[PDB]
Symmetry: D2
C-alpha cells in the first residue's frame, strides 16, 4: 500500500474534504490520527473507514486547532500512540461569504482564527514533533480563492492567501531541518456546495452549471473528493513528494493555473 506504516495526523476529519482524506489515507495503509471538534461525526468517519479496511490502525482525537495548548497536547498524544509523526495534514477550515464592505469584526476574527491561526498552530506543533527525526511532511489546505477569489468572498480569499504565503515562507525556513511544506488547492463537491446548489432556483442552477462547465476545462464539473482528490493526497503524503516544498497543488480540473 502506498502509505504503509506512515504515521499521519489529519485535522478536520469529521466532514467533507477532511473526511475524504482520512478515508483515503486509511485505505492507503497509513496509521491515521483524525482530529476535529465534532467528536461524534469525527469518530463515525474513522469507524466507517475502518469497516472498509479491517485491521487498520486509527484513532480520533478532539482538537481545536485555534487553541495552541490543545494542539500541543492532542498532537503529542497522537504521536505517542503512533510511535512518531511522519505527516500532518491541516484540512480544518471555515467558509463564509460577505460583501467586502460589510464585514463585522467578529466575522473577520473567526475566519482568520480558524483558517490562519489554525494553520500556524498545527504547523508549529508538527514542526517541533518532526524536527528531531530530520524529516517531516506538512500539507496545508489553500484555495483557488487565495489567488483572487469570488464576488462576496474577499474575506475567505484573504485567509487562504495567507496560508499560501505562510506555506512558501516556512518551506524555506524548515527545509534545512528536512521538513517539506506544501499547499493543496481543491475544487470538490462538499456538503456546503450541495446545500448551495439545493437552494438555487432552476434558473440560477442552470446558469451556475453552464458557467462551471466553461470554467473547468477537464469535465466541466466540481470534482469528487474520493475519486479526484484522494490520489493526489496520497502522492503528497507519500515519499514520492520528498523533493517538492513550498508549492501549491491545484486539484481542480484546470479551474486556475499557478504562475
Amino acid at each position: 500500500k502506498l502509505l504503509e506504516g506512515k504515521r499521519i495526523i489529519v485535522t478536520g476529519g469529521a466532514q467533507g474534504i477532511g473526511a475524504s482524506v482520512v478515508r483515503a489515507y486509511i485505505a492507503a495503509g497509513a496509521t491515521v490520527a483524525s482530529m476535529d471538534m465534532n467528536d461524534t461525526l469525527g469518530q463515525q468517519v474513522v469507524s466507517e473507514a475502518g469497516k472498509a479496511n479491517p485491521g487498520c490502525k486509527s484513532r480520533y482525537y478532539h482538537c481545536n486547532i485555534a487553541d495552541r495548548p490543545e494542539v500541543e497536547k492532542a498532537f503529542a498524544t497522537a504521536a505517542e500512540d503512533m510511535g512518531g509523526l511522519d505527516v500532518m495534514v491541516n484540512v480544518a477550515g471555515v467558509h463564509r461569504h460577505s460583501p467586502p464592505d460589510a464585514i463585522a469584526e467578529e466575522l473577520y476574527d473567526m475566519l482568520f482564527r480558524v483558517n490562519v491561526l489554525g494553520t500556524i498552530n498545527t504547523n508549529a506543533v508538527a514542526y517541533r514533533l518532526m524536527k528531531g527525526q530530520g524529516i517531516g511532511n506538512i500539507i496545508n489546505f489553500g484555495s483557488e480563492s487565495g489567488l483572487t477569489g469570488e464576488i462576496n468572498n474577499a474575506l475567505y480569499s484573504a485567509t487562504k492567501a495567507a496560508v499560501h504565503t505562510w506555506t512558501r515562507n516556512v518551506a524555506r525556513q524548515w527545509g534545512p531541518d528536512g521538513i517539506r511544506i506544501n499547499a493543496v488547492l481543491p475544487y470538490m463537491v462538499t456538503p456546503m456546495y450541495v446545500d448551495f446548489r439545493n437552494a438555487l432556483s432552476s434558473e440560477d442552477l442552470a446558469a451556475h452549471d453552464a458557467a462551471t462547465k466553461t470554467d473547468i476545462p477537464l469535465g466541466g464539473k466540481f470534482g469528487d473528493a474520493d475519486k479526484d482528490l484522494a490520489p493526489v493526497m496520497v502522492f503528497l503524503a507519500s515519499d514520492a513528494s520528498h523533493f517538492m516544498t513550498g508549492q501549491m497543488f491545484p486539484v481542480d480540473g484546470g479551474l486556475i493555473a499557478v504562475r
Copy 2:
C-alpha cells in the same frame, strides 16, 4: 501640480513611509487628510510639510484603523472638510519578526488586526464614501514579503499576502462602481531599518550590504521614500492610473518581480 485639488486620505501619516506619502501629496498640490494614532508626530509631519508648501490645505485626524466606528467617523469628517473623497491610501501597518514555530496568539492577533482588519475597515469605509460619485481610488500597502518573505518573518509575510489578494478581489467587485484598488510594494529606508542597521556588528552589516547589493539590481541599496517612492505614489493617486486595478506595484529597484 499633478494632484491639484485631489481630496486624499492617508493613514499612517505620522512616520516612515506614511509620512513620506503625506509630504509627497502635499507637495503635489493635493488636499491631504493625514491620519494616525500618534497625534503629536502626525501633526508635526503635516505642519512641516506645510512649511515647505505655504498655503496648502491639510489636516491631521486621530484614527485607529482597526476600529471601524472610528474609521467611519474620522473618514466622514475628513470628507466633509474636503468636500468629498477622491483617494484613500492605507499606509498604517505593523512589523514584527518571529520564528514561525513560536508565535504567541497575542502576536498573531496584533499583526492581523492592524495589517488586515485595518485594510478591510479603511477600504470598506472609503468605498462607501466614494460609491455615490461613481469613481474612486484606493491604494493599499502590500509588501515583497507577501510573495514569500524572509526567515523569521512568516507572520508578517502572511498578513501582506492577505492584503494582496484582498486588493485583487475587491478590485473585481468594486470596479463596476468605478472604484480602482491597487497595492504598492515598497523597499525603502525606514526608521526600523535604520535601527536594524545600527544594532548590527560591523561584520553583520558588511554581510547585509553585500547581500543587499546583489539582491537589488538597480543601485544595490534600499530606496529613499522621498526620491524613489514619492513619484510612483503621485502617479497612482493621479488620474493617470485610472485604467489599472487589482495590481501590485513593486518600487524596490528590482528586488522582486510580479508574475
Copy 3:
C-alpha cells in the same frame, strides 16, 4: 511637459498602439524617433502628431526589428540625431490566431521572429547605446495572453510569455548598469479588434460585449489607447518610474491581475 527633452525611440509607430505611443510622447514634449516598416503610414503618424504640437522634434526611421544590422544602424542614427538615447519602447509585434494543433512552421517562425527576436534585438541595441551613460529605460510590450491566453491563441500567448520572462531576466542583468526594463500589458481598441467586431454577426457581437462587460471590471469595455494607455506610457517613460524594473504593468481595467 512630463517628458520634456527626453530622447525616445518607439518601434511600431505606424499604426495602432505604437502610433498612440508616438502621439502621447510627442504631446508630452519628448523628442521622438518613430520606427516601423510601413514608411508612408509611419511618417503620416509623425506628421499628424506634429500638427497638434507645433515645433516638436521628431523623425521617422525605417527599421525591421527582426534584422539586428538594421536595428543597429537605425538606432545609432536616431541617437545621433537626438544627441543620445533615454528611452526605447518596443511596440512592434504581430498577432495571428491558430488552433494549437495546426500551427505551420512558417507561422511559428514569423510570430517568434517579430515578437521575440525583435524584442531581443531592440533591447540589445538600446542597452549598448545606453550603457555608457549609466542610465536607461527600456519598455517592452507584453500581453495578458502571455499569462495564459485565449482559445486558438496559444502561439501568440507563448511569444508574449517569452517577452515577459526576457524582461524580468535582463532587468536583473542590466540593473547594475543603471538600465531599467519593464513590460506593458495593454487591453485597448485596435484596428484588428475593430475588424474582428465588424465581421461578427449581431448575435456573436452581443455575446462578446456581454462577456467583455463581465471580464473587465472597470467599464466593461476595451480601453482607448489615447485616453487610458497614454498616461501610463508617459509615467513609464518619465523619471518617475526610475525605481521599478522587471515588472509587468496591466493597463486593462482589471482584465487580469499580476501575482
Copy 4:
C-alpha cells in the same frame, strides 16, 4: 506496478533527464517508446533499462521533434506498436548561455526551434493521436529559468517561459477533449551540470556550493533524477494526476515557488 500497461512516448530519451524518465517508466511497468536523435545512446538507454527489468516492452525511435513530419510518422509508428497512446512526455531540449546583448540570430533560432517548436509539434501530434479516445496526458518540461532565470541565461529562460504559457493555454483548449497538459520544472544533476562543476576552479566551486546550499532549502544540493525526480514523473504519468491540468510542478527542493 504504478504504470502497468501505460503506453508512453518519451522524447529526449538518450541522455540526462530524458534517460532517467525512460528508466523510471520502464521500472514502473510502462510500455515505453523512447525517442531521440542520438540513436546509439538512445538504444543503449533502452537496452540497459531492459536489463534491470527483464521482459519489459520498449522500443527506441529516431525522431527530430523540430520536424513535424518526422514527429507525425514516429509517433504514429509508436502508437501502432503499443496499440495506442496514453502519455507523451517531451523532455528533449537544448541549453546554451549567452550575454543577452550578444545573441546571434542562429543561436536564437536553435533554442526556440528545439525548446518551443519541438514542444508545439510533439504536443500537437500527441493531441491528435489521443483525442479519439477521449483521454490523454501530455507532460512538458519547463524550467525554473522560465520564471525569471539566471545571469547570461535570458534566451533559455525565454524559451521555457513560452513552454509554461503554452502548457497553460492548451490545457484550457484540450481539457474538454479529456487531455491534460502539465509542465515539470526539475533541478537535477545532469551531464552538463557535472561538466560545469568540473571546469571551475576550487574557489568558484566552493562559492557555487555555498550559494546552492542557501538557494535549495531541502538538502542544499541539486537533486538526483533517479531518486528525486522519478517518483514525481511516475505520479504525473499515472492516473493519480487525472484532475490536474495546466500546472507547473517544481521538483527542486524548494529552489523556486509557484504563485
